[PDB]
Design a binder for this molecule. Structure first.
Ligand SMILES: [Zn+2]
Lengths: 50, 191, 49, 152, 93, 70, 286, 287, 53
């Protein structure tokens, strides 16, 4: 169980941090316009199950 | 571990609905399917077994699979009512075993006949020369009743494998209410 | 061919900066936009005058 | 397209005054392939002749930002000057400086300066004693000349 | 009647149906109520206008008229389409 | 050739667009924009943009690496 | 019911390569496979498809095979990789439909509630629109037929998707005459006349054929019905259908005066710019 | 190392499977295997593409389930064509498509099974209509850096490789990676029926239908946009008559002063649509 | 497992930060000292008992 939980940790070591932001408004069906909270604005896209 | 693909053909014809055999004909032939599937499993685990019927339509209830769990499921609620269908039963079983993958495995089929059939002798002799030109051995295990001292099946197995065939047999039905193990006790030895 | 010169847009960018005053040895002093100051070089085409 | 415009000199080597006048609009085409076969067509058609219009057209062909069209320009500029010295063209030393200029450079690619060493092999081949010719005294076209440069 | 100049007046209705004048309106509005006619009525001439006929079982002369008029439409469509195509073909190119 | 070249130009946007604001323009096919990264840039522009749509002050899409008007 | 089905190019190429799969056995085999899609709306969506084992012999030609287990495990694979995607029906090669082409749907109605089919043609001799699609309904007749269970066509086309646009529109590189405007439609203007003609040729051939053979086929319900529908709507009347032609004059009017006014002025203005830059560079050049 | 001529064949279904599966899972790199036939030394022929299932919710991580291998290849054995695996693929969806560290990590483990199993990268973002962008690669060792790496037969392929190209980091990954040319052969049956589809099926069913619908437009809807056209071709015009005046005023044709233009040509093309579909009226309506 | 946690923990520069909140749809939200807000669905080598905003 030590090997199990630490192997779960071993698999979990590869996750990536992700940027936190807010959506200003929706441009098109796929184009989205957000604002990063630390700084600049951006133009982004979504996933397919959102 | 001899190479075939044993195609069991169930008998859900309407004359199998009585109890002249031990509880019910369905249950005795169901345990016959049990012993032949475990017998061909111990004969080879490589080979696989699907089932087919001779009902209103010869339905592929099971694809040719090595596991017997779907066999155990489909031997229940079989709807044992309908006219017998034999002549295109050969054709549907043959093309079902031309839907195989390893064609070095023998097209071995077993047939369960417990009802009077209305075959033409010329149709079954076209089937005889057909299966001569198709490399198929079928041992037919008769059940129930027919035109008694069953007819056209002696003719079909005799015209099937003349001149060193030795692979197709005809297990006729014993017309006595006997245990199913006594019915399969000679087919469990050989053909 | 002018439309096929699109590998030019894909290269890089360029800064806008404010000049305080030049000095000797063909150089100037530039305070770019938010940052400090830089003693930089001229090209071949522009006049120091 | 490359071989299609390479066919021009191999069908019209009997007269060399034609091909510069008709490929003077193909030399500046859209892709490097038509430019490349165009350069090689001017190379194979004006090979045995001290043309000036061929050197005129092939002069800015060494400047295009694709490597192998510059390479084909090097091969064709070797073809224009078989045993040519200082009166048929002033471009003899002007290209002898050029091939050494591009081979002794480091930052140019291999496909660029492959033609440079190849052209220095061409310009000095046989000790200048032999040259190439698709033409004889008898009017008949010299067959292994055509076949050798064609497969080349 | 061949469905082209077929606006029927009161007279042939009152002659066939052998009913009087002020009953043919009931007669036609009954069929309009049912829907086995899809026309309309003027009454300055008592012309009951016909924009309808019942689909009827194809007989031998109906077979022949079907094939003949169908070909009549088909060859006209073809002959005019070929002229359109050939007249503006070389600008398609 | 020309229309396919026009659309081969159009691979530029597609999903990494950053938003600057239009500030000035030098002349034809050359402008000045200041990003929301605080600083200010001398950029080139695409021949796609209808030039009516600009030059008070417009939020405009920039490329990330090249940082040019799109 | 269904509004229309939307077929993507991927499934059609997934039929062509399937014919390439079974083109080596050759002997007697139609192409048959299983359709995948998404019930979007009353409109239908199609994304993917795949194969199935199937064969059919000559004597007692009702011998047909649909592997349930292949469907089970491979649909398990496709559901495992994509949960948005699920089954919508099946397809086959479709020269036409024959008599045995009801039993496939009557098998897999226990998978999709409305198991829709797709009839294509791998041989593009069809100068019509491929990817026909039927759906089975019942129309129980005035003659007291017990249950007539007939496939009926719902219209179809080829839809669009952003990535498959990149794919198809790069895989062509072949033909572009459109320069989309007054002439992107004229090729199809030849097509609409000519492809009314082909259908009408099928019509007259059928009409001549029913009298000869079928023993008295003639359609018996939908011949007289839809024939009188045909014979109730060729309006060639001349009372105000003539008087649509000053609206035709009005159609001419706007475009005539827009062209005549503005076209000449724009071309003239460009002549002004050309001749100014011609003579003012001529006096500097020469 | 010891190289050969660089050449990769395709199947037409492959590219479509690549774009669809790399689009449907876009922000995470989606694993997929690649299936074909090693014909010879220098050409490789992919003929089939099946995508891999996904797992836990993290970028670039990849796996090969062997029971999925057995069952998928078993289904393709009972499908008409069983053949040999030839490699794999994924996407680099936001960038200029270089194989990452995880990519070379699964490559050094995957290269011990097959020599020329080529890693391929689709990108459904940096391609719009005139790019695939097909992008395949091949790993180099580190043991053979004592020896050379440079036979490169059929030289055209390398000089072609350096043109479709950008970066500082691709330039940093010409080590560990040398690409390979990809080209396309098309069935004229398939080409002609895709031409059928996309030059005939953009016209709609029975083909009279939408052109008679344009004929329906030409007497009910067109007059409203004709009113819009006439109002535009008054309002734009009384200020674009100031334009040649001001051309005479300012200079001979200098830099762009301000916003507006003529823009009339587009409105006239819409009027040409009006007249052509009015021409459609006589043709369709009569006979 | 120790090889992987050697490959992660021997990266001796640890950017310090502050846990902003703690979602549960087991998910922690981070503002670093550079003031960049980060999301992570996977927490890592600390326990949710020892964490507070
Ligand atoms: Zn990657």
């Amino acid at each position: 169980k030590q090997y199990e939980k630490s192997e779960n940790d071993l698999k979990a070591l590869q996750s990536v941090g992700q940027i936190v932001g807010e959506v200003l408004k929706q441009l098109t069906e796929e184009k989205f316009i957000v604002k990063a909270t630390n700084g600049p604005r951006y133009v982004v896209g979504c996933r397919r199950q959102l | 571990m001899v190479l075939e693909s044993t195609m069991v053909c169930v008998d859900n014809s309407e004359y199998m609905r009585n109890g002249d055999f031990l509880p019910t004909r369905l249950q005795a032939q169901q345990d016959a399917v049990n012993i032949v599937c475990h017998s061909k499993t111990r004969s080879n685990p490589e080979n696989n077994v699907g089932l087919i019927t001779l009902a209103n339509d010869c339905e592929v209830l099971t694809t040719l699979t090595p596991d017997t769990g779907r066999i155990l499921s489909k031997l229940h609620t079989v709807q044992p009512k309908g006219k017998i269908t034999f002549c295109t039963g050969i054709r549907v079983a043959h093309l079902a075993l031309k839907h195989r993958q390893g064609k070095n495995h023998k097209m071995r089929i077993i047939a369960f006949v417990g009802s009077p059939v209305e075959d033409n002798e010329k149709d079954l002799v076209k089937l005889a020369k057909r299966l001569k030109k198709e490399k198929v051995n079928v041992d037919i295990i008769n059940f129930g009743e027919e035109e008694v001292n069953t007819e056209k099946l002696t003719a079909f197995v005799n015209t099937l494998n003349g001149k060193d065939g030795t692979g197709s047999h005809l297990v006729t039905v014993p017309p006595g209410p006997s245990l199913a193990d006594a019915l399969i006790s000679s087919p469990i030895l050989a053909g | 061919l002018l439309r096929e010169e699109l590998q030019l847009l894909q290269e890089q960018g360029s800064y806008v900066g404010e000049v305080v005053r030049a000095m000797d040895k063909k150089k100037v002093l530039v305070k770019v936009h938010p940052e400090g100051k830089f003693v930089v070089d001229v090209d071949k085409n522009i006049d120091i005058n | 397209r490359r071989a299609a415009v390479e066919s021009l000199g191999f069908i019209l080597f009997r007269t060399p005054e034609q091909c510069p006048s008709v490929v003077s609009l193909l030399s500046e085409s859209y892709n490097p392939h038509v430019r490349y076969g165009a350069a090689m067509a001017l190379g194979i058609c004006c090979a045995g002749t001290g043309n000036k219009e061929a050197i005129n057209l092939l002069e800015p062909m060494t400047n295009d930002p694709v490597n192998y069209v510059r390479q084909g320009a090097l091969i064709a500029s070797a073809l224009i000057m078989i045993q040519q010295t200082e009166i048929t063209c002033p471009k003899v030393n002007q290209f002898r400086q050029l091939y050494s200029k591009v081979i002794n450079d480091k930052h140019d690619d291999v496909m660029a300066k492959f033609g440079a060493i190849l052209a220095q092999g061409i310009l000095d081949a046989g000790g200048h004693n032999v040259t190439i010719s698709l033409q004889s005294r008898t009017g008949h076209t010299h067959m292994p000349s055509v076949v050798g440069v064609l497969v080349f | 009647r061949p469905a082209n100049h077929r606006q029927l007046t009161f007279e042939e209705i009152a002659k066939s149906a052998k009913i009087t004048v002020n009953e043919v309106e009931l007669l036609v509005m009954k069929a309009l109520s049912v829907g086995l006619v899809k026309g309309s009525i003027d009454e300055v001439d008592k012309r009951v206008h016909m924009t309808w006929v019942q689909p009827r079982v194809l007989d031998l002369q109906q077979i022949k008229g079907m094939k003949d008029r169908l070909e009549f439409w088909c060859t006209d469509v073809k002959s005019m389409e070929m002229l359109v195509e050939h007249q503006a073909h070389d600008i398609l190119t | 050739e020309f229309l396919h070249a026009q659309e081969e130009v159009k691979r530029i946007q597609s999903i990494p667009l950053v938003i600057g604001q239009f500030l000035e323009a030098v002349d034809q096919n050359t402008a000045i924009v200041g990003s929301t990264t605080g600083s200010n840039y001398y950029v080139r522009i695409l021949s796609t943009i209808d030039r009516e749509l600009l030059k008070p002050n417009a939020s405009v899409a920039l490329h990330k690496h090249s940082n040019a008007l799109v | 019911a269904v509004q229309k089905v939307v077929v993507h190019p991927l499934v059609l190429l997934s039929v062509v390569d399937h014919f390439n799969r079974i083109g080596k056995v050759g002997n007697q085999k139609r192409v048959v496979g299983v359709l995948l899609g998404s019930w979007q709306k009353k409109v239908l969506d199609v994304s993917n498809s795949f194969a199935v084992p199937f064969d059919e012999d000559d004597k007692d030609d009702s011998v047909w095979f649909l592997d349930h287990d292949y469907l089970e495990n491979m649909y398990g694979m496709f559901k495992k990789v994509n949960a948005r995607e699920r089954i919508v029906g099946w397809y086959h090669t479709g020269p036409k439909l024959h008599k045995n082409d009801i039993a496939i749907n009557e098998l897999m109605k226990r998978y999709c509630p409305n198991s829709v089919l797709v009839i294509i043609d791998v041989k593009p001799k069809d100068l019509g629109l491929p990817t026909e699609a039927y759906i089975s309904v019942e129309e129980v007749h005035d003659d007291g037929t017990p249950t007539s269970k007939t496939f009926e066509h719902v219209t179809s086309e080829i839809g669009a998707e952003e990535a498959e646009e990149v794919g198809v529109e790069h895989l062509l590189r072949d033909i572009k005459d459109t320069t989309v405007g007054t002439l992107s439609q004229r090729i199809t203007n030849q097509v609409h006349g000519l492809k009314g003609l082909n259908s009408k040729l099928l019509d007259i051939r059928s009409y001549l054929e029913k009298v000869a053979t079928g023993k008295l086929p003639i359609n018996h319900q939908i011949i007289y019905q839809l024939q009188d529908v045909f014979n109730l709507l060729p309006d060639v009347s001349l009372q105000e259908f003539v008087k649509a032609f000053y609206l035709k004059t009005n159609d001419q009017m706007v475009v005539v005066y827009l062209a005549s006014l503005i076209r000449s002025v724009v071309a003239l203005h460009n002549l002004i710019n050309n001749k100014i830059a011609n003579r003012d560079a001529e006096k500097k050049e020469g | 190392a010891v190289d050969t001529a660089e050449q990769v064949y395709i199947s037409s279904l492959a590219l479509l499977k690549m774009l669809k599966h790399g689009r449907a899972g876009v922000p995470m790199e989606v694993m997929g295997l690649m299936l074909g036939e090693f014909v010879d030394d220098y050409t490789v022929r992919v003929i089939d593409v099946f995508a891999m299932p996904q797992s836990g919710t993290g970028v670039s991580v990849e796996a090969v389930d062997p029971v999925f291998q057995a069952k998928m290849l078993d289904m393709l054995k009972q499908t008409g064509r069983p053949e040999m695996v030839v490699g794999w693929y994924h996407s680099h969806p936001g960038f200029g498509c270089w194989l990452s560290g995880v990519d070379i990590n699964t490559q050094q483990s995957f290269e011990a099974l097959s020599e020329r199993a080529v890693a391929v990268v689709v990108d459904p973002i940096q391609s719009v209509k005139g790019k695939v962008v097909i992008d395949a690669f091949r790993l180099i060792n580190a043991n053979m850096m004592v020896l050379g790496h440079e036979p490169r037969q059929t030289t055209s392929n390398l000089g072609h490789l350096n043109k479709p190209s950008i970066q500082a980091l691709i330039h940093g990954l010409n080590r560990h990676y040398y690409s390979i040319t990809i080209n396309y052969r098309k069935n004229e049956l398939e080409q002609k029926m895709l031409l059928n589809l996309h030059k005939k099926s953009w016209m709609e069913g029975l083909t009279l239908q939408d052109y008679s619908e344009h004929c329906k437009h030409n007497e009910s809807v067109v007059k409203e946009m004709l009113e819009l056209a006439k109002n535009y071709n008054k309002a734009v015009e009384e200020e674009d008559k100031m334009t040649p005046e001001q051309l005479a005023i300012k200079n001979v044709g200098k830099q762009d002063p301000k916003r507006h233009l003529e823009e009339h040509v587009d409105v006239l093309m819409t009027s040409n649509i009006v007249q052509c579909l009015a021409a459609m009226l006589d043709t369709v309506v009569f006979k | 497992e120790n090889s992987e946690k050697i490959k992660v923990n021997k990266t001796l520069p640890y950017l310090v930060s502050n846990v902003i909140e703690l979602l549960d749809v087991k998910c922690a939200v981070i503002k670093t000292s550079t003031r960049q807000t980060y999301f992570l669905p996977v927490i890592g080598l600390v326990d949710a008992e020892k964490l507070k905003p």
